[model samples]
Target: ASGFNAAEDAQTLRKAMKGLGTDEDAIINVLAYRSTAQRQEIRTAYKTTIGRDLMDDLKSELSGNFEQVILGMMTPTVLYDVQELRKAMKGAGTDEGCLIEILASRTPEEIRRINQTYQLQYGRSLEDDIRSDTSFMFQRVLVSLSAGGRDESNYLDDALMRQDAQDLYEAGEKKWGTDEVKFLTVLCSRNRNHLLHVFDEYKRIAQKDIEQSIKSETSGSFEDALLAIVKCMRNKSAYFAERLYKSMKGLGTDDDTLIRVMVSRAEIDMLDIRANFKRLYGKSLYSFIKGDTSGDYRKVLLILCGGDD
Candidate 1:
């Protein structure tokens, strides 16, 4: 992340949209290159000097996907995450993909913050909404994740890992029907470092990867949740890279998914995800985005993406 002069950026933004025509390049240059903290400062400076809300001005001036990406950039990261969670739960069918991607990969502290923010913003507990919306084992997994109780300690127990792997193997492959509770408990409760060992032991004993076992044993959203945990634990960057590839692979683009992955990972491990995309797909993510997307939307995404490497 680079430093910026908020007042100067604010003036630049003001001039970009002033008078006859809007300067799209100037707006993108200021917002995309600056860090989130710097954007917030620019917002504050814009209001005090310009005597108008920065977001409101941008809203009036821009429209469609261009507006969306810029507005997404302006909001604080935590608030943006909770807004996405709320959007996923709205309407008829829940967006299970969005829910699983956000919940399964987040840390306990991150989930706790999301829960608190969700309640304040929406006047209902996130856990309660998920419970109402989902059912059966899928519901159980989401509820457990919303609790934010995963063990975060550094201590990894070899004996415990072996025992848990045995438990998982017995619950899945050894039994006639899968024991959903055992899978949920081990997958959700154990720390990531500990679960890595458990997964290794699981393959050694069961002759299959944990993901393969889960695929064979379970179905629907429950399966997706468990597999997300395994993949995110194993390599979060690769997991995201896979998600991004899935979003744009076929005929029409999945704009929501494209936007979500790009915006969410922009500040975090986007560079790592880019590297993994090339390694896994045999092509750069930037090239894929360029091929699939067009116009201002593509421009903003490519900027967030940084480069093709």
Candidate 2:
């Protein structure tokens, strides 16, 4: 279904690396333009005709952020997410921001597959890793997310929404001390559609947005996780739009976040993210990437980005 010819792409990639110097442009042209499914087919075709694993050849030739983007583009979406989660948890301290972005934003089915794949690939339970690495409400929310407990139904009940909103108000804003459990339960268990309704009701009842209440009520990773959920519920595309801007903003760049968002959303909603980027930042994402990055890395990102805003 993809526009490119996989067999031709396989050959182009092969020839790109055949000589003394690697053709980084050819690699980016083939890999970046091809959809992930197309890239998967290219991988198989490369193996059959060239008699070498495409990933292995690319790995040997490329390094650093450029290499990461090429490899990330080749990886299937679900498995890419699993690896990202593992990376988030690997070092001395967890990348709690990465963890929140992944776990909070993913759907119930995606979480289940991530858990399954994590166990198969890493030979350990994702929940076990979360519990061992995190603490308190942060651990609890992540564990609940790892359980894939989100209610997927589209049904919305007005009374129930109001009750949930009132409960959240009492748990945080209307009380001396916050009840973290109530916040976690409602935020994690409710479906996205229902939670949007709840958020609307919460603002009316508390005179503040749910995210505002979460900010006042909680601290640290717990606060970040709750706010992420609310932001995601309200506007997933806008959330990513903001994430993309944040990654490229400030001194230097968060290449990991930039790469992850670009590669992951390339197929799913890069167009929407790009639109939101313009709306949110009052500039084109294309220009932002062009200004913030250079060389092949910038080229691959711009290609995945599709066009100038």
Candidate 3:
């Protein structure tokens, strides 16, 4: 269905940026509708044809949030992820939520890609930086996930399910102290369908909600990591719904999170995330963005939101 001509597209973008005053609308109009796969062709074409770096021109012309989203959309998703992870860990303090959000949600193959790209781009080990930045069980959980060895099969072991649930119960509910390694192994290793069964069985044996058990037993980012896996397992859309809700709901705005979620999920499960936003918060994500943001940044987000629920 895509009959896009990258050469033509490149000039349109070239025209947008060439003049004394930049055309933001033209940029968005051209970039917004194209798939990332499609959009990147323009990047290649613009340079090949014009002999000018389009992104360098883009970064020069676009200001603030608009530039941020533009650059993210232009980068391939895996490249985008590695860039985000580097930014998260580079500054005064680590952005653990970013780490957890990515580490907890991506597939093993995706994680492997992230690790490899992180190494290629940054010239240091992703796991080593993560370990140096974070501490204790939190570090362990991320390292386990970053190892890219989570079980991904559909085959559920009934007996093993029972053992996992029972093991969690022993690990937290009845133990003298939390056995975080057991919790980490269970949460990170099991496939999603089997994890769903473990949740049900944990409820039966522990007679407590898994969320409550996690809160009672663990603390800090480690607890966040555990809850993230369980929540994403239960419903990924709702998990992102909650994340997006928090990102935009508060004062000053968590623009980093807003950009991260919207840009990363735009082509993945955004429509589902919008639906869950409506169900959970009783308002459309489109309307929420309309109210929360302003200017070209708002326009970009609205476009990514796709349509009102």
For each candidate in the order shown, give its overall lDDT on alpha carbons: 0.91, 0.90, 0.91
TM-score of candidate 2 relative to the true fold = 0.96
- After superposition, candidate 3 runs with Cα above 4 Å error: none
Tens-digit lDDT track of model 2 for 1-309: 455677888888899998798999988877877788988999999999998999999999998889999999999999999999999889898888888999988999999999999999999999999988899999999999888979999889888888999899889744468988889989999988899999889899888888878887899999998988888888789999998899998788989999999999899988989899999999999999989999898999899899998
Clashing pairs in 2: none
Q: How does each model score on TM-score?
A: 0.96, 0.96, 0.96
Scored by lDDT, model 2 comes in at 0.90
Say which prediction, candidate 1 or candidate 2, comes out ahead on lDDT: 1
For model 1, name the residue pairs that clash: none
Give me the runs in candidate 2 sitting further than 4 Å from their true place: 1-3
* Candidates 2 and 3, the one with greater lDDT: 3
Range of the 10 consecutive residues with the lowest summed lDDT in candidate 2: 172-181
Model 1 misplacement above 4 A:
1-3, 174-176
